[PDB]
Structure formats: C-alpha cells, structure tokens
Amino acid sequence: ATKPCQSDKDCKKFACRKPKVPKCINGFCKCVR
C-alpha cells in the first residue's frame, strides 16, 4: 500500500484519523481523503 509521498521510496507508512491519507510533499504534511 503506497500513498503518494514526496519520495514514496524513502517515505514511511503513516496513518491518521479520517481523512486518513497523509500526503507529505515539500516538507508539508496533512491528511486528505
């Protein structure tokens, strides 16, 4: 299960309260659905 992360290669699986998809890009991290 790969979530679109800045560098998914070296990004580590993390989950959050809904919205449950934490997209980290350009140092920014927040949760979308």
PDB file of all heavy atoms in Angstrom:
ATOM      1  N   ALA A   1       0.845  -1.215   0.000  1.00  0.00           N
ATOM      2  CA  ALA A   1       0.000   0.000   0.000  1.00  0.00           C
ATOM      3  C   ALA A   1       0.872   1.253   0.000  1.00  0.00           C
ATOM      4  O   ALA A   1       1.424   1.640   1.033  1.00  0.00           O
ATOM      5  CB  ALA A   1      -0.934  -0.003   1.203  1.00  0.00           C
ATOM      6  N   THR A   2       1.007   1.875  -1.166  1.00  0.00           N
ATOM      7  CA  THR A   2       1.815   3.078  -1.314  1.00  0.00           C
ATOM      8  C   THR A   2       0.932   4.319  -1.448  1.00  0.00           C
ATOM      9  O   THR A   2       0.124   4.420  -2.374  1.00  0.00           O
ATOM     10  CB  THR A   2       2.736   2.969  -2.553  1.00  0.00           C
ATOM     11  OG1 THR A   2       1.963   2.614  -3.713  1.00  0.00           O
ATOM     12  CG2 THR A   2       3.835   1.932  -2.335  1.00  0.00           C
ATOM     13  N   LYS A   3       1.076   5.253  -0.512  1.00  0.00           N
ATOM     14  CA  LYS A   3       0.415   6.551  -0.611  1.00  0.00           C
ATOM     15  C   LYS A   3       1.367   7.550  -1.277  1.00  0.00           C
ATOM     16  O   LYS A   3       2.559   7.571  -0.965  1.00  0.00           O
ATOM     17  CB  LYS A   3      -0.015   7.054   0.780  1.00  0.00           C
ATOM     18  CG  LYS A   3      -1.140   6.237   1.417  1.00  0.00           C
ATOM     19  CD  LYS A   3      -1.521   6.769   2.803  1.00  0.00           C
ATOM     20  CE  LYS A   3      -2.740   6.054   3.386  1.00  0.00           C
ATOM     21  NZ  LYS A   3      -2.523   4.592   3.545  1.00  0.00           N
ATOM     22  N   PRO A   4       0.861   8.371  -2.220  1.00  0.00           N
ATOM     23  CA  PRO A   4       1.692   9.333  -2.961  1.00  0.00           C
ATOM     24  C   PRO A   4       2.457  10.285  -2.035  1.00  0.00           C
ATOM     25  O   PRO A   4       1.900  11.262  -1.528  1.00  0.00           O
ATOM     26  CB  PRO A   4       0.676  10.105  -3.821  1.00  0.00           C
ATOM     27  CG  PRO A   4      -0.494   9.187  -3.940  1.00  0.00           C
ATOM     28  CD  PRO A   4      -0.552   8.425  -2.642  1.00  0.00           C
ATOM     29  N   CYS A   5       3.729   9.976  -1.801  1.00  0.00           N
ATOM     30  CA  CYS A   5       4.583  10.784  -0.939  1.00  0.00           C
ATOM     31  C   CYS A   5       5.779  11.319  -1.721  1.00  0.00           C
ATOM     32  O   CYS A   5       6.311  10.621  -2.600  1.00  0.00           O
ATOM     33  CB  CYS A   5       5.068   9.958   0.260  1.00  0.00           C
ATOM     34  SG  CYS A   5       6.103  10.877   1.427  1.00  0.00           S
ATOM     35  N   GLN A   6       6.189  12.552  -1.365  1.00  0.00           N
ATOM     36  CA  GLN A   6       7.321  13.265  -1.983  1.00  0.00           C
ATOM     37  C   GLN A   6       8.352  12.296  -2.550  1.00  0.00           C
ATOM     38  O   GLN A   6       8.698  12.349  -3.735  1.00  0.00           O
ATOM     39  CB  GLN A   6       7.983  14.175  -0.935  1.00  0.00           C
ATOM     40  CG  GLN A   6       9.188  14.952  -1.449  1.00  0.00           C
ATOM     41  CD  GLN A   6       8.833  15.931  -2.551  1.00  0.00           C
ATOM     42  OE1 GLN A   6       8.512  17.088  -2.287  1.00  0.00           O
ATOM     43  NE2 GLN A   6       8.888  15.471  -3.791  1.00  0.00           N
ATOM     44  N   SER A   7       8.819  11.405  -1.695  1.00  0.00           N
ATOM     45  CA  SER A   7       9.688  10.326  -2.111  1.00  0.00           C
ATOM     46  C   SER A   7       9.191   9.029  -1.489  1.00  0.00           C
ATOM     47  O   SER A   7       9.775   8.523  -0.529  1.00  0.00           O
ATOM     48  CB  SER A   7      11.138  10.620  -1.704  1.00  0.00           C
ATOM     49  OG  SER A   7      11.605  11.816  -2.313  1.00  0.00           O
ATOM     50  N   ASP A   8       8.071   8.529  -2.021  1.00  0.00           N
ATOM     51  CA  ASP A   8       7.474   7.264  -1.568  1.00  0.00           C
ATOM     52  C   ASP A   8       8.529   6.175  -1.339  1.00  0.00           C
ATOM     53  O   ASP A   8       8.364   5.325  -0.463  1.00  0.00           O
ATOM     54  CB  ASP A   8       6.418   6.768  -2.573  1.00  0.00           C
ATOM     55  CG  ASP A   8       7.018   6.336  -3.905  1.00  0.00           C
ATOM     56  OD1 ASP A   8       7.395   7.217  -4.706  1.00  0.00           O
ATOM     57  OD2 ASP A   8       7.113   5.115  -4.160  1.00  0.00           O
ATOM     58  N   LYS A   9       9.614   6.216  -2.119  1.00  0.00           N
ATOM     59  CA  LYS A   9      10.715   5.260  -1.975  1.00  0.00           C
ATOM     60  C   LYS A   9      11.252   5.254  -0.543  1.00  0.00           C
ATOM     61  O   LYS A   9      11.448   4.193   0.060  1.00  0.00           O
ATOM     62  CB  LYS A   9      11.854   5.615  -2.940  1.00  0.00           C
ATOM     63  CG  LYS A   9      13.105   4.756  -2.755  1.00  0.00           C
ATOM     64  CD  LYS A   9      14.264   5.240  -3.620  1.00  0.00           C
ATOM     65  CE  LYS A   9      15.536   4.442  -3.351  1.00  0.00           C
ATOM     66  NZ  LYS A   9      15.938   4.500  -1.919  1.00  0.00           N
ATOM     67  N   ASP A  10      11.473   6.447  -0.003  1.00  0.00           N
ATOM     68  CA  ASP A  10      12.047   6.609   1.328  1.00  0.00           C
ATOM     69  C   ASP A  10      11.060   7.290   2.272  1.00  0.00           C
ATOM     70  O   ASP A  10      11.450   7.911   3.267  1.00  0.00           O
ATOM     71  CB  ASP A  10      13.372   7.386   1.257  1.00  0.00           C
ATOM     72  CG  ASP A  10      13.275   8.682   0.467  1.00  0.00           C
ATOM     73  OD1 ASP A  10      12.972   9.735   1.066  1.00  0.00           O
ATOM     74  OD2 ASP A  10      13.522   8.650  -0.761  1.00  0.00           O
ATOM     75  N   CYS A  11       9.775   7.132   1.977  1.00  0.00           N
ATOM     76  CA  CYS A  11       8.727   7.571   2.887  1.00  0.00           C
ATOM     77  C   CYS A  11       8.227   6.366   3.671  1.00  0.00           C
ATOM     78  O   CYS A  11       8.142   5.256   3.136  1.00  0.00           O
ATOM     79  CB  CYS A  11       7.566   8.225   2.123  1.00  0.00           C
ATOM     80  SG  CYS A  11       8.012   9.737   1.240  1.00  0.00           S
ATOM     81  N   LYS A  12       7.909   6.584   4.935  1.00  0.00           N
ATOM     82  CA  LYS A  12       7.494   5.505   5.820  1.00  0.00           C
ATOM     83  C   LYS A  12       5.994   5.575   6.081  1.00  0.00           C
ATOM     84  O   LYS A  12       5.446   6.653   6.314  1.00  0.00           O
ATOM     85  CB  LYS A  12       8.299   5.569   7.127  1.00  0.00           C
ATOM     86  CG  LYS A  12       9.762   5.138   6.957  1.00  0.00           C
ATOM     87  CD  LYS A  12      10.606   5.391   8.209  1.00  0.00           C
ATOM     88  CE  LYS A  12      11.182   6.809   8.251  1.00  0.00           C
ATOM     89  NZ  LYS A  12      10.128   7.856   8.228  1.00  0.00           N
ATOM     90  N   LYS A  13       5.347   4.413   6.028  1.00  0.00           N
ATOM     91  CA  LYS A  13       3.898   4.306   6.160  1.00  0.00           C
ATOM     92  C   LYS A  13       3.395   4.948   7.452  1.00  0.00           C
ATOM     93  O   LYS A  13       3.827   4.591   8.552  1.00  0.00           O
ATOM     94  CB  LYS A  13       3.476   2.829   6.096  1.00  0.00           C
ATOM     95  CG  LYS A  13       2.004   2.587   6.426  1.00  0.00           C
ATOM     96  CD  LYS A  13       1.584   1.144   6.150  1.00  0.00           C
ATOM     97  CE  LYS A  13       2.480   0.132   6.860  1.00  0.00           C
ATOM     98  NZ  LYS A  13       2.455   0.283   8.342  1.00  0.00           N
ATOM     99  N   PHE A  14       2.482   5.898   7.300  1.00  0.00           N
ATOM    100  CA  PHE A  14       1.861   6.583   8.423  1.00  0.00           C
ATOM    101  C   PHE A  14       0.371   6.756   8.148  1.00  0.00           C
ATOM    102  O   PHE A  14      -0.031   6.989   7.007  1.00  0.00           O
ATOM    103  CB  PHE A  14       2.531   7.947   8.648  1.00  0.00           C
ATOM    104  CG  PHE A  14       1.939   8.741   9.788  1.00  0.00           C
ATOM    105  CD1 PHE A  14       2.216   8.405  11.106  1.00  0.00           C
ATOM    106  CD2 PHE A  14       1.106   9.826   9.540  1.00  0.00           C
ATOM    107  CE1 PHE A  14       1.673   9.133  12.151  1.00  0.00           C
ATOM    108  CE2 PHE A  14       0.561  10.554  10.579  1.00  0.00           C
ATOM    109  CZ  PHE A  14       0.846  10.209  11.886  1.00  0.00           C
ATOM    110  N   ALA A  15      -0.441   6.631   9.188  1.00  0.00           N
ATOM    111  CA  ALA A  15      -1.887   6.781   9.067  1.00  0.00           C
ATOM    112  C   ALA A  15      -2.391   7.793  10.085  1.00  0.00           C
ATOM    113  O   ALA A  15      -1.720   8.060  11.087  1.00  0.00           O
ATOM    114  CB  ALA A  15      -2.579   5.436   9.259  1.00  0.00           C
ATOM    115  N   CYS A  16      -3.567   8.349   9.830  1.00  0.00           N
ATOM    116  CA  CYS A  16      -4.145   9.371  10.694  1.00  0.00           C
ATOM    117  C   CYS A  16      -5.666   9.240  10.741  1.00  0.00           C
ATOM    118  O   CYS A  16      -6.261   8.500   9.947  1.00  0.00           O
ATOM    119  CB  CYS A  16      -3.741  10.760  10.184  1.00  0.00           C
ATOM    120  SG  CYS A  16      -4.085  11.017   8.428  1.00  0.00           S
ATOM    121  N   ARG A  17      -6.283   9.944  11.683  1.00  0.00           N
ATOM    122  CA  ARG A  17      -7.736   9.955  11.818  1.00  0.00           C
ATOM    123  C   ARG A  17      -8.364  10.636  10.603  1.00  0.00           C
ATOM    124  O   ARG A  17      -7.867  11.672  10.152  1.00  0.00           O
ATOM    125  CB  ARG A  17      -8.135  10.665  13.120  1.00  0.00           C
ATOM    126  CG  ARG A  17      -9.639  10.729  13.374  1.00  0.00           C
ATOM    127  CD  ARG A  17      -9.939  11.177  14.802  1.00  0.00           C
ATOM    128  NE  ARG A  17     -11.375  11.315  15.063  1.00  0.00           N
ATOM    129  CZ  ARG A  17     -12.108  10.409  15.714  1.00  0.00           C
ATOM    130  NH1 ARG A  17     -11.581   9.238  16.058  1.00  0.00           N
ATOM    131  NH2 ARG A  17     -13.380  10.660  15.996  1.00  0.00           N
ATOM    132  N   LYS A  18      -9.450  10.047  10.088  1.00  0.00           N
ATOM    133  CA  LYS A  18     -10.084  10.491   8.838  1.00  0.00           C
ATOM    134  C   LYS A  18     -10.196  12.023   8.757  1.00  0.00           C
ATOM    135  O   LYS A  18     -10.698  12.656   9.689  1.00  0.00           O
ATOM    136  CB  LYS A  18     -11.472   9.852   8.681  1.00  0.00           C
ATOM    137  CG  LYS A  18     -12.410  10.083   9.862  1.00  0.00           C
ATOM    138  CD  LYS A  18     -13.814   9.549   9.582  1.00  0.00           C
ATOM    139  CE  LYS A  18     -13.792   8.086   9.152  1.00  0.00           C
ATOM    140  NZ  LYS A  18     -15.160   7.548   8.941  1.00  0.00           N
ATOM    141  N   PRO A  19      -9.737  12.657   7.646  1.00  0.00           N
ATOM    142  CA  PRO A  19      -9.149  11.972   6.465  1.00  0.00           C
ATOM    143  C   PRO A  19      -7.869  11.191   6.800  1.00  0.00           C
ATOM    144  O   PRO A  19      -7.049  11.644   7.594  1.00  0.00           O
ATOM    145  CB  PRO A  19      -8.843  13.129   5.500  1.00  0.00           C
ATOM    146  CG  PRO A  19      -9.694  14.261   5.966  1.00  0.00           C
ATOM    147  CD  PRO A  19      -9.764  14.119   7.458  1.00  0.00           C
ATOM    148  N   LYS A  20      -7.697  10.022   6.175  1.00  0.00           N
ATOM    149  CA  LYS A  20      -6.685   9.053   6.613  1.00  0.00           C
ATOM    150  C   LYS A  20      -5.477   8.970   5.673  1.00  0.00           C
ATOM    151  O   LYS A  20      -4.631   8.090   5.847  1.00  0.00           O
ATOM    152  CB  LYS A  20      -7.309   7.656   6.786  1.00  0.00           C
ATOM    153  CG  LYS A  20      -7.659   6.953   5.480  1.00  0.00           C
ATOM    154  CD  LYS A  20      -8.098   5.512   5.727  1.00  0.00           C
ATOM    155  CE  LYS A  20      -8.279   4.737   4.429  1.00  0.00           C
ATOM    156  NZ  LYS A  20      -9.374   5.291   3.591  1.00  0.00           N
ATOM    157  N   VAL A  21      -5.369   9.871   4.695  1.00  0.00           N
ATOM    158  CA  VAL A  21      -4.261   9.798   3.734  1.00  0.00           C
ATOM    159  C   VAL A  21      -3.338  11.010   3.888  1.00  0.00           C
ATOM    160  O   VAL A  21      -3.584  12.074   3.319  1.00  0.00           O
ATOM    161  CB  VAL A  21      -4.777   9.726   2.270  1.00  0.00           C
ATOM    162  CG1 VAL A  21      -3.618   9.584   1.282  1.00  0.00           C
ATOM    163  CG2 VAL A  21      -5.776   8.581   2.102  1.00  0.00           C
ATOM    164  N   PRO A  22      -2.265  10.868   4.694  1.00  0.00           N
ATOM    165  CA  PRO A  22      -1.314  11.944   4.958  1.00  0.00           C
ATOM    166  C   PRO A  22      -0.279  12.079   3.842  1.00  0.00           C
ATOM    167  O   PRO A  22       0.671  11.298   3.763  1.00  0.00           O
ATOM    168  CB  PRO A  22      -0.644  11.529   6.287  1.00  0.00           C
ATOM    169  CG  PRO A  22      -1.252  10.208   6.666  1.00  0.00           C
ATOM    170  CD  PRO A  22      -1.882   9.651   5.419  1.00  0.00           C
ATOM    171  N   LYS A  23      -0.477  13.062   2.976  1.00  0.00           N
ATOM    172  CA  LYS A  23       0.436  13.304   1.869  1.00  0.00           C
ATOM    173  C   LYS A  23       1.513  14.304   2.281  1.00  0.00           C
ATOM    174  O   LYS A  23       1.214  15.457   2.595  1.00  0.00           O
ATOM    175  CB  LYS A  23      -0.336  13.816   0.644  1.00  0.00           C
ATOM    176  CG  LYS A  23       0.557  14.138  -0.551  1.00  0.00           C
ATOM    177  CD  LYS A  23      -0.252  14.504  -1.794  1.00  0.00           C
ATOM    178  CE  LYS A  23      -1.067  13.324  -2.315  1.00  0.00           C
ATOM    179  NZ  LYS A  23      -1.762  13.646  -3.590  1.00  0.00           N
ATOM    180  N   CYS A  24       2.760  13.847   2.300  1.00  0.00           N
ATOM    181  CA  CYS A  24       3.898  14.703   2.621  1.00  0.00           C
ATOM    182  C   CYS A  24       4.634  15.116   1.351  1.00  0.00           C
ATOM    183  O   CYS A  24       5.220  14.276   0.662  1.00  0.00           O
ATOM    184  CB  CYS A  24       4.861  13.986   3.574  1.00  0.00           C
ATOM    185  SG  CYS A  24       4.184  13.711   5.229  1.00  0.00           S
ATOM    186  N   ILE A  25       4.583  16.411   1.040  1.00  0.00           N
ATOM    187  CA  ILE A  25       5.271  16.972  -0.123  1.00  0.00           C
ATOM    188  C   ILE A  25       5.859  18.335   0.233  1.00  0.00           C
ATOM    189  O   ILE A  25       5.201  19.145   0.891  1.00  0.00           O
ATOM    190  CB  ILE A  25       4.319  17.127  -1.346  1.00  0.00           C
ATOM    191  CG1 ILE A  25       3.810  15.754  -1.821  1.00  0.00           C
ATOM    192  CG2 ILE A  25       5.023  17.860  -2.490  1.00  0.00           C
ATOM    193  CD1 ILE A  25       2.897  15.823  -3.029  1.00  0.00           C
ATOM    194  N   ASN A  26       7.107  18.568  -0.179  1.00  0.00           N
ATOM    195  CA  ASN A  26       7.792  19.845   0.053  1.00  0.00           C
ATOM    196  C   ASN A  26       7.836  20.191   1.540  1.00  0.00           C
ATOM    197  O   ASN A  26       7.803  21.363   1.921  1.00  0.00           O
ATOM    198  CB  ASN A  26       7.120  20.976  -0.744  1.00  0.00           C
ATOM    199  CG  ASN A  26       7.381  20.879  -2.239  1.00  0.00           C
ATOM    200  OD1 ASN A  26       7.614  19.796  -2.775  1.00  0.00           O
ATOM    201  ND2 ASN A  26       7.344  22.010  -2.923  1.00  0.00           N
ATOM    202  N   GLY A  27       7.931  19.163   2.376  1.00  0.00           N
ATOM    203  CA  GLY A  27       8.035  19.366   3.812  1.00  0.00           C
ATOM    204  C   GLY A  27       6.688  19.540   4.485  1.00  0.00           C
ATOM    205  O   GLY A  27       6.600  19.537   5.716  1.00  0.00           O
ATOM    206  N   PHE A  28       5.638  19.694   3.687  1.00  0.00           N
ATOM    207  CA  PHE A  28       4.287  19.842   4.216  1.00  0.00           C
ATOM    208  C   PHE A  28       3.643  18.470   4.387  1.00  0.00           C
ATOM    209  O   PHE A  28       3.795  17.598   3.526  1.00  0.00           O
ATOM    210  CB  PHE A  28       3.435  20.711   3.280  1.00  0.00           C
ATOM    211  CG  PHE A  28       3.969  22.109   3.092  1.00  0.00           C
ATOM    212  CD1 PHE A  28       4.725  22.437   1.975  1.00  0.00           C
ATOM    213  CD2 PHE A  28       3.713  23.096   4.033  1.00  0.00           C
ATOM    214  CE1 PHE A  28       5.210  23.719   1.799  1.00  0.00           C
ATOM    215  CE2 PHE A  28       4.198  24.379   3.862  1.00  0.00           C
ATOM    216  CZ  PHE A  28       4.947  24.691   2.744  1.00  0.00           C
ATOM    217  N   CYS A  29       2.946  18.278   5.502  1.00  0.00           N
ATOM    218  CA  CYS A  29       2.264  17.020   5.794  1.00  0.00           C
ATOM    219  C   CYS A  29       0.881  17.285   6.386  1.00  0.00           C
ATOM    220  O   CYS A  29       0.749  17.991   7.387  1.00  0.00           O
ATOM    221  CB  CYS A  29       3.092  16.175   6.771  1.00  0.00           C
ATOM    222  SG  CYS A  29       4.709  15.689   6.131  1.00  0.00           S
ATOM    223  N   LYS A  30      -0.145  16.726   5.758  1.00  0.00           N
ATOM    224  CA  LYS A  30      -1.512  16.827   6.254  1.00  0.00           C
ATOM    225  C   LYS A  30      -2.335  15.682   5.661  1.00  0.00           C
ATOM    226  O   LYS A  30      -1.851  14.968   4.779  1.00  0.00           O
ATOM    227  CB  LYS A  30      -2.109  18.216   5.928  1.00  0.00           C
ATOM    228  CG  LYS A  30      -3.444  18.515   6.623  1.00  0.00           C
ATOM    229  CD  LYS A  30      -3.412  18.192   8.124  1.00  0.00           C
ATOM    230  CE  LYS A  30      -2.382  19.021   8.893  1.00  0.00           C
ATOM    231  NZ  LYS A  30      -2.775  20.452   9.006  1.00  0.00           N
ATOM    232  N   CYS A  31      -3.565  15.505   6.126  1.00  0.00           N
ATOM    233  CA  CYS A  31      -4.347  14.325   5.786  1.00  0.00           C
ATOM    234  C   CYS A  31      -5.502  14.675   4.854  1.00  0.00           C
ATOM    235  O   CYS A  31      -6.280  15.594   5.120  1.00  0.00           O
ATOM    236  CB  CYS A  31      -4.886  13.685   7.068  1.00  0.00           C
ATOM    237  SG  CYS A  31      -3.603  13.188   8.244  1.00  0.00           S
ATOM    238  N   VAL A  32      -5.577  13.938   3.754  1.00  0.00           N
ATOM    239  CA  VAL A  32      -6.636  14.073   2.771  1.00  0.00           C
ATOM    240  C   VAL A  32      -7.376  12.745   2.625  1.00  0.00           C
ATOM    241  O   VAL A  32      -6.974  11.724   3.212  1.00  0.00           O
ATOM    242  CB  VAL A  32      -6.086  14.516   1.388  1.00  0.00           C
ATOM    243  CG1 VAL A  32      -5.409  15.880   1.490  1.00  0.00           C
ATOM    244  CG2 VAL A  32      -5.125  13.471   0.815  1.00  0.00           C
ATOM    245  N   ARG A  33      -8.476  12.775   1.885  1.00  0.00           N
ATOM    246  CA  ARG A  33      -9.274  11.585   1.621  1.00  0.00           C
ATOM    247  C   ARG A  33      -9.458  11.444   0.110  1.00  0.00           C
ATOM    248  O   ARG A  33      -8.783  10.597  -0.504  1.00  0.00           O
ATOM    249  CB  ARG A  33     -10.637  11.687   2.338  1.00  0.00           C
ATOM    250  CG  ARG A  33     -11.341  10.348   2.584  1.00  0.00           C
ATOM    251  CD  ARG A  33     -11.707   9.612   1.299  1.00  0.00           C
ATOM    252  NE  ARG A  33     -12.497  10.446   0.394  1.00  0.00           N
ATOM    253  CZ  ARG A  33     -13.828  10.418   0.306  1.00  0.00           C
ATOM    254  NH1 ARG A  33     -14.538   9.589   1.065  1.00  0.00           N
ATOM    255  NH2 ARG A  33     -14.446  11.220  -0.551  1.00  0.00           N
TER     256      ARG A  33
END
